[PDB]
Design a protein around this ligand. Sequence first.
Ligand SMILES: Cc1ncc(C[n+]2c([C@](O)(CO)[C@@H](O)[C@H](O)COP(=O)(O)O)sc(CCOP(=O)(O)OP(=O)(O)O)c2C)c(N)n1
Ligand SMILES: Cc1ncc(C[n+]2c([C@](O)(CO)[C@@H](O)[C@H](O)COP(=O)(O)O)sc(CCOP(=O)(O)OP(=O)(O)O)c2C)c(N)n1
Ligand SMILES: [Mg+2]
Ligand SMILES: [Mg+2]
Ligand code: NA
Ligand code: NA
Lengths: 621, 621
Amino acid sequence: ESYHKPDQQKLQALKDTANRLRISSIQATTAAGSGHPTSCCSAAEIMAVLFFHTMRYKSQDPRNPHNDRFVLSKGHAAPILYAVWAEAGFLAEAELLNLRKISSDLDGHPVPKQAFTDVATGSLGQGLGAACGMAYTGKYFDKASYRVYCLLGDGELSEGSVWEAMAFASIYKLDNLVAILDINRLGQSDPAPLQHQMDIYQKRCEAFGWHAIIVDGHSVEELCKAFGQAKHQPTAIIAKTFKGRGITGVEDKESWHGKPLPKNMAEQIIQEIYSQIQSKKKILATPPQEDAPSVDIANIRMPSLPSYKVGDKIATRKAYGQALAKLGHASDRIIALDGDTKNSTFSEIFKKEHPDRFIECYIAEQNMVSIAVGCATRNRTVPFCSTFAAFFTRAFDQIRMAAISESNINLCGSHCGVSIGEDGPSQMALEDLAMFRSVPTSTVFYPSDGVATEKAVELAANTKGICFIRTSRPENAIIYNNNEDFQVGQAKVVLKSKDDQVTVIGAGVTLHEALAAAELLKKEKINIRVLDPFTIKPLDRKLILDSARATKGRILTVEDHYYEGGIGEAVSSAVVGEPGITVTHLAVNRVPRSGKPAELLKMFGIDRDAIAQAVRGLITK
Amino acid sequence: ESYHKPDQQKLQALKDTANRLRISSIQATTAAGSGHPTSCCSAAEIMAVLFFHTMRYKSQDPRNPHNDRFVLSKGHAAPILYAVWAEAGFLAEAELLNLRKISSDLDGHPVPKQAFTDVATGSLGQGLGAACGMAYTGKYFDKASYRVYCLLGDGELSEGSVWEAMAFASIYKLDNLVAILDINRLGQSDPAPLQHQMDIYQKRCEAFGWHAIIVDGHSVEELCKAFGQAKHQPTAIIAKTFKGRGITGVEDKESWHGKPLPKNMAEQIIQEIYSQIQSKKKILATPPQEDAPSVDIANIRMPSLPSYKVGDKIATRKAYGQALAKLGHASDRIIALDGDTKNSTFSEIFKKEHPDRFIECYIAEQNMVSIAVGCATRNRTVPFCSTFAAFFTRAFDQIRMAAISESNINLCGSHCGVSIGEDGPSQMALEDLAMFRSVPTSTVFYPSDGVATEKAVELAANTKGICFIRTSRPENAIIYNNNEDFQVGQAKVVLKSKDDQVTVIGAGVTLHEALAAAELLKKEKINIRVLDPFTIKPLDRKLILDSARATKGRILTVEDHYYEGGIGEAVSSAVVGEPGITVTHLAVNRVPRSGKPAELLKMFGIDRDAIAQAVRGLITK
Ligand SMILES: Cc1ncc(C[n+]2c([C@](O)(CO)[C@@H](O)[C@H](O)COP(=O)(O)O)sc(CCOP(=O)(O)OP(=O)(O)O)c2C)c(N)n1
Ligand SMILES: Cc1ncc(C[n+]2c([C@](O)(CO)[C@@H](O)[C@H](O)COP(=O)(O)O)sc(CCOP(=O)(O)OP(=O)(O)O)c2C)c(N)n1
Ligand SMILES: [Mg+2]
Ligand SMILES: [Mg+2]
Ligand code: NA
Ligand code: NA
């Protein structure tokens, strides 16, 4: 479709639109008594041109799969996003004045309870990565005509996650992606480092493989023209703007970030702005080409039961890769992402079988999570991203924001605990249960053998929210029949007798250490009940207490994790006050060190001998 | 001091050194059965030239404050670091063969139990930020002649944290810093994105303000020359290398990252390499100019007691800034860092009073933490870094690695919980207690008024490990006398009577809600004991149980945090099994939303009315 070169009337209408957007941003934030009108005002021409000249979308159906995508990475400009959607006719204009109220959904930063919002972006520097996932999906998966536009602040460009996204987009040739940089000179508490050194922004963007265009960000004509030419690269529109543009005496000034105008001032400024508006008549949105495919929404089922033999040995990290590849044969919706760790996590098995649905994200965990979030938007794909669980700590803010975004992504973190052995603590995940349990939409799977791992992958695929699967480096025996039924929130008793003296709860390597401890103790005529949680969150509280009532009220938890936030604390929190119920914990008490897996389990007090000694001390207490 | 231009004999000795380093890296990793010899071999000439021509250091005193610093950012090249320190005469050569053993300190990645290691770097992309802190300290604080050298991998350069550090170094004119990029074409599981496109690396470095020099990374002469010229910019030595250099048939090949040579192969390769060595005679290290100043090690004490009046109102975020500024008058060792949030966290007060000791880190939380770690190395400074607690999640891997680095840094995170109100959940820290409690060297302060905040700052300054202070946005009454004694691990009973029916544990805003609940309940002739933990980690278990025994065994915890990993779980874990002891929790059950602070405390069930209802239900249970 050809560029429609605007006439003066259309340009004036875009100017009028921009000024209406300024007025609304001021009105809403003054009414609220909080917000960021000066951050809205620098972006007003950009927003007017994108929404009312460049982009193609259904104004009454913002989530429509054919629409261009817009990502407001500088999320504190939310009032101007709300204003554009009122201008487009989707929101009632009166509702804008209810910004930030508990009675409204026009919250302080954008969130997906709003139909026009796909991802939450209030933590700066994350929007471009989500936009990259949307664009990758558009070009390679949907193979559709929609474009993706992402508006960033200049201070925001200090976040390294932005530059990971920059690099991703040029690696993957995202010529359907446009980044708009609101170079308004100022951050929150000082000028942004580069201020109005436009040439340095351009050099940085070009060095990272983008086509970079410097524009006057307050010229609707320059913006129309720059937006109106597609490229064969991701394109950066580097817009020179003034913070607080159009607010006399505030434009280009410090001390105004995140400060609303007092009511007397708002009135005077609004009259000034209003005097610039030539017509009240609004521009209409233009709809998209409807070429996005149908996506099925059905449950995804493994093509057959697991085919692992009891007593065979496999690491759960390898079972993960096998299971993911298997599920990829059952649904084309499954995609896999990994951060240069595919030979360690075994996501390489998926890549071998389904290369078109594997996304190499390189050593860039923050961006990987954001790509996954973007790919999951509008239910276009079912992403599984993997790395070492330790390195998911690099992406905690992206994971946190993924829950605020109501995202359905699946994360598999390998190499948990000290049982990795010789690499040492940098590679050892000892805080990942704490981290993922604190994510409010999470389900935490901790499979203890290959069968449980395959079942966890299948369950995760069909579970909403942030699903985490904790996998382990060493090989462990298969203990479950292939036809064992597994469910979220259902634990398994893997050893029991009628005279059990303690219920021992372990998972992964510590489940297997608990089973070996049981063999040790049998020597001593002491029996223990052994329970495998399967999911750490939610925890099968009923089976845990039923078990504990069978074993004199005594529970012992043993985990390859630090004491805080893990299995022991989950169990304690679930059962505290239950009469005759006691909980004793074994976990890792400090930063570990290198050695063989068995040696470290011993050093840190979570192997078979430690468990046996804790059981004896309970019995003799 | 002039460059000493090496003769052919010196160049040959550097070549011989490089080849000795290759042999040792192979021997050690073959002996261990794990490790990364091909990642060592690409760096062997770089390491030989740095250690035996360019840098100045005391070989027998690696921690000496006058020494040049070396940071191995690509930490999996640890065997070659160990080999250089054996070559320099500090380590016994036999010990190299004990790599990765539980009987050795030559662990899989470098760690500060090694005298020659300042920061742990096994999580890629963090070393350059630590190096920036070291260089900033050298140039601006110590005002000393030492230089800082940081070796990075090429895959590693995909981490956004690297680019934050790149930008920091050019902002702050770190002309005493050199980054060496080991452009060996390959990452772990595939070629690095840019492969041997040296010109693109150069353009990226130059765009970020560095002086960039492309060299043959296997030419000792080119390396000597490039290292031998100081600049007025941070300098990037962009070294074209081959992975596995010198290992015939492995050099430049895929499928060899992190794979040791089998013993038969090692023998053949080592003989080949050894045949290239012209002399066994080793080069000696050259010592530094001794111009680093003396740093005192004494306790740091506030110059006076707090001067806050009971019943006055102040937010703990503002008390933090006031307290930090005050302590800065007592010791020149205190430095402050903030990520473009100084007007929100009130670290601006410190900046006003002590501008030379404030480091603006911009919107780059990962790098901020790494700068702090680097500044704290060798005890040169006592850093306090601040941002919103929510945004510390962006830096969790840096914090995790800071504990592995045995670092003494202080972190103050503001804007905790839903009590911030209108910005919404992107800004609300609801997982920070979970996160910081999981850091094994942490102390977690949660001050409930301005007096407690000042005492927490003072205590943190004098406490080893990762200290976290959780501050709050809204103003709250001062409840403590200025002369109240505070200690790590000591809680306070702030309300008690002889007929108390429940012990209510709150902190920050929920302490004040618990006190208002107590006033509500008094109406009903119900008294409650109210306990302020002060530190969440370590928790005053004794006072909590003594309190609970006075209140019919009943504890109620109330927190502006998610359920997992916070105060309620800490308390439960501490007291589970204690007879007649029950714990009931109130916390935030899901992602919040915008509204007034009081409205959100109500919506999420953690305000005075929620507490009063939970107390009544205990009593009537
Ligand atoms: C990852 C990260 N780090 C820091 C910040 C903080 N911050 C912003 C806000 O969080 C808004 O999103 C902040 O203004 C709060 O509302 C302040 O709360 P108070 O309680 O103090 O009122 S916005 C921002 C600066 C961004 O500058 P630019 O990128 O240049 O954008 P522009 O406004 O100039 O267009 C900072 C530092 C966040 N949010 N995320
Ligand atoms: C933040 C982050 N993300 C990923 C990685 C993984 N990784 C490395 C190692 O972690 C070593 O530090 C990895 O090799 C493990 O030892 C493998 O464990 P196994 O159990 O599978 O044996 S190293 C690395 C690739 C780095 O490439 P370059 O930067 O190019 O360096 P070079 O080797 O070519 O010189 C990756 C992805 C870590 N560690 N950190
Ligand atoms: Mg700005
Ligand atoms: Mg490499
Ligand atoms: Na899922
Ligand atoms: Na401290």
